[PDB]
Amino acid sequence: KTSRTFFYWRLRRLLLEDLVKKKIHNANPELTDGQIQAMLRRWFVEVEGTVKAYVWDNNKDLAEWLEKQ
Amino acid sequence: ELQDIMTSVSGRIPPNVEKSIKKEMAQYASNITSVLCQFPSQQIANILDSHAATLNRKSEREVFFMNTQ
């Protein structure tokens, strides 16, 4: 029943994450992906605050944030 | 500042992270008094984010969080 809403917001941010990470690897292709994953989180949490750390697991707000970049 | 803080966080330490911090403070220190002595920002962050690359699937990551913070 709430799977639809979930899948919308999560995927949209997954895609956004994919697209931005694509930008980053383009920025430096030699750097590995794993460190990049964490790195993206780090850049998010750094800029936006620990208050949104858990929010990373919140589709909308992370979704809201990713678009806003 | 890395002397004094890493002295105040010498413990509670995962020895991968202890040998990493203690080596690499050792060689900011090794590279001090060179005319061309710089902080290895990108280097320390990327390595830590390697072991975030390995730890990170579980959110069980709070000593490591506390070294990466």
UniProtKB/Swiss-Prot annotation, chain A:
Q: What is the effect of changing A63V?
A: Frequency <0.004; may play a role in breast cancer susceptibility
The source's domain of life comes to: Eukaryota
Compartment list:
Cytoplasm, Cytosol
Q: In which tissues is it expressed?
A: Expressed in brain, placenta, skeletal muscle, renal, pancreatic and adipose tissues; expressed at low level in pulmonary tissue; not detected in the liver.
Please describe the post-translational modifications of this protein: The biotin cofactor is covalently attached to the central biotinyl-binding domain and is required for the catalytic activity.
Q: Which residues cross the membrane?
A: none
Which disease annotation does the entry carry? Acetyl-CoA carboxylase-alpha deficiency: An autosomal recessive inborn error of de novo fatty acid synthesis associated with severe brain damage, persistent myopathy and poor growth.
- Functional description taken from the UniProt entry: Cytosolic enzyme that catalyzes the carboxylation of acetyl-CoA to malonyl-CoA, the first and rate-limiting step of de novo fatty acid biosynthesis. This is a 2 steps reaction starting with the ATP-dependent carboxylation of the biotin carried by the biotin carboxyl carrier (BCC) domain followed by the transfer of the carboxyl group from carboxylated biotin to acetyl-CoA.
Query: What is stated about domains?
Result: Consists of an N-terminal biotin carboxylation/carboxylase (BC) domain that catalyzes the ATP-dependent transient carboxylation of the biotin covalently attached to the central biotinyl-binding/biotin carboxyl carrier (BCC) domain. The C-terminal carboxyl transferase (CT) domain catalyzes the transfer of the carboxyl group from carboxylated biotin to acetyl-CoA to produce malonyl-CoA.
Q: How does it assemble?
A: Monomer, homodimer, and homotetramer. Can form filamentous polymers. Interacts in its inactive phosphorylated form with the BRCT domains of BRCA1 which prevents ACACA dephosphorylation and inhibits lipid synthesis. Interacts with MID1IP1; interaction with MID1IP1 promotes oligomerization and increases its activity.
Stated name of the protein? Acetyl-CoA carboxylase 1
Query: Which gene name does the record give?
Result: ACACA
